[PDB]
Every structure is written in C-alpha cells, then in structure tokens.
Design a protein around this nucleic acid. Structure first.
Lengths: 373, 49, 49, 146
RNA sequence: UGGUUUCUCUUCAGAUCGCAUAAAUCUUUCGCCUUUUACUAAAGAUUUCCGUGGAGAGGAACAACUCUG
C-alpha cells in the first residue's frame, strides 16, 4: 500500500492543466502512482518510498511535463479505527421519517483483521465456509456467523458489519438484513472517515435493530443509504476511536563495528529493534526492525550518514498499529512548530489532516451526526 | 547484459565501467538502481541448442 | 511470497559467485556448506504456499 | 600513505557528483564544500504563508536537514535547476584482508560469522541414490588438472 | 607474412583525448568602490600554454634475434 503521500502544485498558477496533464501521463507510467485529486483542490500523489517518489518527481518535472511544479514535504496516510467497543446505541433518521436503523461499533480480533486483509476469506464463498472460519479463528456464535453482513470498501477492507444481532424473521420488509440499504452504507461510509477522512479498518458494525417501511416505492428507497452512512459515521465517533499510523519494515545490513549506531538512529525515530543477528557467510550482521512511517523520512539517509557510510537500509510495507492519544480528545494544545513526543499526537495528526476538506478545524462536530435522543 | 554479449557480437563489456544495457532510462544510468523493467528477447541456445 | 501466490514457477540462481572466492577468500569445503545454507533457506522459504 | 578501503566512505557526502547538488540547490553539505554562492538570484522568501506551504498544515515529525535535500533533491527541493543526481547504494565490497602471511591461500578467517548447523539432511546411512548412481562409471581426469 | 628502438613532419582529435588542471579574452551577474589597473566568484563559450592519442614519409643502433600466425 502506497502509504506515503506528497502534494504537488505548479509554481505559476496559470499552468494548472499543464501539471494536470503531466500527472495523468505519470499515472500511466508507474503502476502504483495513484494520483488522487483531493477535495481541497490539492493534487496529491501516493507513493511507496523515498526513491519511488523521487523517481516519480524526476519524470514529471523533466520529461512528462515541462513546468516547475512545487512539491511539499510528504505525509503518511492515516487510518480510522475504533479501539474500544460502543458506548451507546445510535438512532438514525430517514428524511421520510419512517426508517431508523441502530448499529453499535465493536473492533475485531487480531487474527480476523489479518486474515481479511490477506484475502483469505471470500465474500463469494458459501455461507458454511464463512461459518467454519468464524467458528475456528474467531470462535463466535453460529447464529451470528450464519447471517454476517458485507465487508468494507470494495469487498476488501476489514469492516465486516454484523447484521445478525436482530433475529432473522424480525421485519423482512425491505431486505431483512444488510442487502440493499445497509450494504451500500457500509461500503461508502467506510471510505470517507469521520475522524480524519482516512480509511476505516477493523470495525465490526453490530446492527442491533432497524426500522423499515412497508412500501419502499412510496417511502424513501434510496434515502436510507445516506442515512446509514450518517449512522456508520456516528458509530465510529461513539466507540472511542484512534488513528492508526503505518509502519515500515527496515532491514539494515552493517558490520559489527557499526551496530549501536543503528540502534541509536532508530531510537531517535521511535523504532523498535525486532531481531539483530549475525548473518552467516558475510561478516556484516543483519538488523531487522520496525519504524513508523510518519517519522521514517530520511531514515535510510540517516542510517548511512551516522554509520560512516558502511550501512544500507530498505523500507518495506508493514501492517498498521494504533497511534497513541485520541483525535476526539480535548484539552491538548498542539504546538505549531517543533512538536512534542507527548501522547497528544492524535490531536496534532487530526489537525494536520485538516489541509483537505471534511475533517477541518473544530472536529468536535460529530454530534451533528450523532445527536442524542 | 552477459546474455546479450553471448548472443550479439557487440563487444562493449566491462573494460572500465559496466555495460548495463537493460536500464534504458537516463535516470537509471545516473542513480544506478533502475526504475523501469525492460523486456529482452534473444536466442539463448540450450545444451543441444 | 509474491511469486508463489500468483501460481507461477520458481527457479533460484546463485549469481555473483565470484565474491565467495575473490572477495571473501573462503575455503572450498566451507563454501559448499554455505551454498547449501542458501538452498535450504530458499526451499524453506518456498514452503509457505 | 593511502586511505583506500571501499568506494562507499566518500559516497553520500563527498562524491564529486554530490557537490553539484550542493551548488545548484545552494545548500552546503556540513563539511564538504566551502559555501559556494547560488547560481540564480532568487534565494528564498517568495511567499510567507501560502495555502500550499502553510506552517500549520505540516506534521514536522523530523526536520529535513541539508543532507536530506542533497540525496533526493527532486522530492524535497521546490523548483530545482540543473541538479546532477548521485549514485545510490554502493554495494558491500568489504574484503577480509590477511593479518599475517603464515595462514594459507584460502583460509576461513576468524572474523566471519560461521554456519551453525550444516547438518540439516539425514545421510548417516548411504543414500539409495548412491546405489542408483553406482552404475555411473568414471575414469577420466577431473575438470581441471589437479 | 618477416624490424625492437629513436628523432624529425602531415592530418583528425568528441575517449575522464588530462584517473590532474593554469592564464587571458568576450557576454551577463555580486561585493567593495574614490581615478584606473592589480581585484571576489557564479553561468556560458573563444584563444594561448603545460601535454597526449592512430597513420602514411626520411636517418641511427645486431636487424637480424627470426616475433605472431
């Protein structure tokens, strides 16, 4: 996954389609370069590593488009995960004043999120095959596993809702489960995050009870899909969320004379040394470790600088982990320059994510989607 | 490049510098990492060949 | 992990074999023990899919 | 009177192609050049707080030093001009030199991490492939004259 | 097929011709500036000098030792 995201804008603002045509041609050359135009008008470019983004900026500025395009400092793509379970049930409202679907939010297990992200379980598989993995890996009830809802965005994101807290023959008016209205709601609501407009991950939406209309052509048929998206955004806000920063796998090779310099460099960037062991054959020992991608910029350049040029590191993609703090937490005055390693980083990350639209400043407006009743 | 020098009679091998013919981009020759795959079709004989 | 998941073939090739002699000065009896350590690790990593 | 160890000591901050990025981007390497002036005239202060380069909309987890902009200049320096690229990732060409000429020609050096097991196979008994290859005769000289 | 050297003179050099590297001039830039030359170094291209590379021409030393094939 292209976790690194660097914005690009031309120097002269009159050369706007010239940079737009160059970003289209650069998207055809590199496969992983997915140029997503943000809602704030800033043309973003998703990248893998520092050498990948520098090679993409080399052709876009010198070969694909002859225009001086200014590029800012990159930033890693965050996540929107519910750490704890739900605190109170939701109460949505259809514009026809007929439907009201309630859904609680609970996180998934560690093995369930890793298996769904690796495309092990299949939505096209049979219901008995989905129940066997849920009884073995998750060890849940057979009634809830037999009537599980759809997955997250594009049937690949680990956001499998639970449409089986209600009984099967409860209403059965429109669909009876997550088939038509709640299926498109969990597929579209998990894309745009209510926390910092990121991707939702590891959030099982337990639909407790819902209200349907007897005449779907008379009442709101397609109006429940934006109504469920407001209920899905209210569920993540009412479950104590936490933004998840990505990790980068670093395997640096170095001799034994320069070994503590690799440990000192990772300590400045808050990296945990996983396994350090001498490789057989070559006298250069291997040191595989983890590094957060939000502070891994120039880590390969810093590992070669401090170790007298006798080291070399490569950044590979790694699964995500929750950053400390909470974006909905208040009383955390973030500094504008030179931030702290204090655990109030989630409030600073949500304010830094406000460069695009959506989750702007004063992000405590989640009660507008989660009004009490 | 060693398969090209075995197939083609283009003797321009590693006299002083390398002879990386697969890296066609100019940034791949300056940086030395290569940022584009290049398909090569040649006639490599087997033992019977 | 990417090649075995795509249901393709696999064939290892220990390239740069001149570094084991001209750059390490390893004895030939220990070189076969090191080359068997690569083929055991490559076949051991191939036993995932 | 020589200081030749590898081609990777002077690679990242003293290579001759690396100083072209130090002169064109007008950013000195800490120790390499003698602070050559800028090629053009416009140095900085083009805009104070633009909508693209705002100080509030940036997560400064680590500062971008001058050594970072000399390595990958296109991803860090806004609008470069005639930047020569550096050569990336010189290989581990480390060689175990002989301490004294009493050891033989090819010798397992003590400054080498050895192979621990080397007994993964179970061939204490003679293998059945040896009896299968027992009908494979050989009487010629080996591949080189020993 | 048959010659190791050395010194003179006739071209093109787009190879780090130079694994290292000087001065002057021209067109633009900065700092001092008080008349000017001697000035500081950033960009580009024009000479001079320190030198060199293949290929025919003429002398000297064993060209005969017999070199590759």
């Amino acid at each position: 996954t292209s976790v690194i995201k660097i914005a690009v804008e031309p120097v002269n603002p009159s050369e706007l389609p010239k940079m737009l045509d160059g970003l289209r041609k650069v998207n055809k050359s590199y496969p992983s370069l997915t140029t997503k135009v943000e809602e704030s008008g800033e043309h973003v470019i998703l990248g893998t590593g520092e050498l990948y983004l520098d090679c993409v900026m080399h052709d876009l500025r010198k070969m694909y488009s002859e225009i001086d395009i200014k590029v800012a400092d990159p930033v890693v793509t965050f996540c929107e995960t519910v750490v704890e379970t739900s605190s109170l049930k939701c109460f949505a409202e259809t514009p026809n004043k007929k439907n009201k679907i309630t859904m609680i939010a609970e996180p998934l297990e560690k093995g369930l999120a890793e298996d769904i992200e690796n495309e092990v379980v299949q939505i096209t598989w049979n219901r008995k095959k989905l129940g066997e993995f849920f009884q073995t890996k998750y060890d849940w009830d057979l009634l809830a596993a037999r009537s599980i809802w759809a997955f997250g965005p594009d049937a690949t994101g680990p956001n499998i809702l639970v449409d089986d807290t209600l009984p099967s023959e409860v209403d059965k008016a429109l669909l009876g489960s997550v088939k038509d209205s709640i299926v498109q709601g969990f597929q579209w609501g998990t894309r745009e995050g209510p926390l910092c407009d990121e991707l939702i991950r590891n959030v099982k939406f337990k639909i407790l009870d819902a209200v349907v209309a007897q005449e779907p052509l008379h009442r709101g048929g397609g109006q429940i899909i934006p109504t469920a998206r407001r209920v899905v955004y209210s569920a993540f806000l009412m479950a104590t969320p936490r933004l998840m920063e990505p990790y980068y796998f670093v395997e640096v090779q170095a001799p034994a004379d320069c070994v503590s310099a690799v440990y000192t460099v990772l300590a400045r960037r808050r990296g945990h040394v996983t396994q350090d062991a001498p490789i057989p054959g070559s006298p250069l020992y291997t040191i595989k470790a983890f590094i957060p991608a939000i502070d891994s910029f120039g880590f390969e350049t810093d590992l070669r600088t401090h170790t007298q040029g006798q080291a070399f590191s490569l950044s590979v993609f790694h699964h995500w982990q929750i950053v400390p703090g909470d974006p909905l937490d208040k009383s955390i005055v973030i500094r504008p320059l030179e931030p702290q390693p204090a655990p109030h980083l989630a409030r600073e990350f949500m304010i830094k994510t406000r460069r695009r639209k959506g989750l702007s400043e004063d992000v405590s407006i989640s009660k507008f989607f989660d009004d009490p009743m | 490049d060693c398969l090209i020098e075995q197939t083609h009679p283009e003797i321009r091998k590693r006299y002083d510098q390398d002879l990386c013919y697969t890296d066609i981009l100019f940034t791949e020759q300056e940086r030395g990492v290569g940022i584009k795959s290049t398909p090569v079709t040649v006639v490599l004989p087997d033992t019977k060949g | 992990k990417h090649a075995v998941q795509e249901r393709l073939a696999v064939t290892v090739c220990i390239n740069k074999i001149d570094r084991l002699i001209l750059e390490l000065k390893l004895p030939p009896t220990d070189a076969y023990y090191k080359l068997r350590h690569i083929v055991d690790e490559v076949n051991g990593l191939i036993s995932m899919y | 009177l020589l200081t030749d160890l590898v081609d990777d000591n002077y690679f990242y901050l003293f290579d001759l192609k690396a100083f072209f990025t130090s002169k064109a981007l007008n950013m000195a390497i800490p120790g390499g050049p003698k602070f050559e002036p800028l090629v053009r005239d416009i140095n900085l202060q083009d805009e104070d707080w633009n909508e693209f380069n705002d100080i509030n909309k940036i997560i400064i987890r680590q500062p971008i030093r001058t050594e970072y902009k000399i390595a990958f200049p296109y991803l860090y320096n806004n609008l470069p001009h005639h930047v020569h690229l550096t050569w990336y990732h010189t290989p581990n060409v480390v060689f175990i030199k002989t301490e004294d000429p009493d050891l033989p020609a090819f010798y397992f050096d003590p400054l080498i991490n050895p192979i621990s097991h080397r007994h993964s196979v179970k061939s204490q008994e003679p293998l059945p492939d040896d009896d299968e290859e027992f009908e494979l005769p050989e009487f010629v000289e080996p591949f080189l004259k020993d």
